[PDB]
Ligand SMILES: NCCCCCCNS(=O)(=O)c1cccc2c(Cl)cccc12
């Protein structure tokens with residue numbers, strides 16, 4: 006990924022990396038290679054209530070696939086989380102376009118992370 010994103014991944018503390026790593030494992034749940042691909046990508050999207058097609062799944066991976074690997078590995082999935090975090094920027098001018106569907110990284114992470122304790126009423130989630 007980008008040098009900046011790469012640094013961001015390394016910057017994350019043990020807890021931060023562990024927190025993100027949880028999504029990676031869940032994302033590649035059953036993944037033979039262990040990386041997140043379109044098949045795995047769609048699985049996570051389904052959990053979030055999204056059902057993107059294979060074409061969309063590959064495109065989504067490309068977003069975090071600077072190397073054009075086509076898949077989101079441990080370092081790649083971390084970049085996605087970092088990308089959304091950016092310099093504390095969210096954006097609201099994007100509006101529904103060239104997609105019509107917007108999924109927040111934080112919301113997605115909670116969907117994947119929220120599979121153990123709590124999750125019934127968030128509360129400090
Ligand atoms: N404010 C949100 C920041 C934008 C970055 C999130 C991307 N938003 S996204 O809809 O393209 C998206 C959602 C969930 C998982 C994704 C995976 Cl595993 C790969 C690629 C895209 C993914």
Ligand SMILES: [Ca+2]
Pocket residue numbers: 069070071072073074075076077078081
């Ligand atoms: Ca990659």
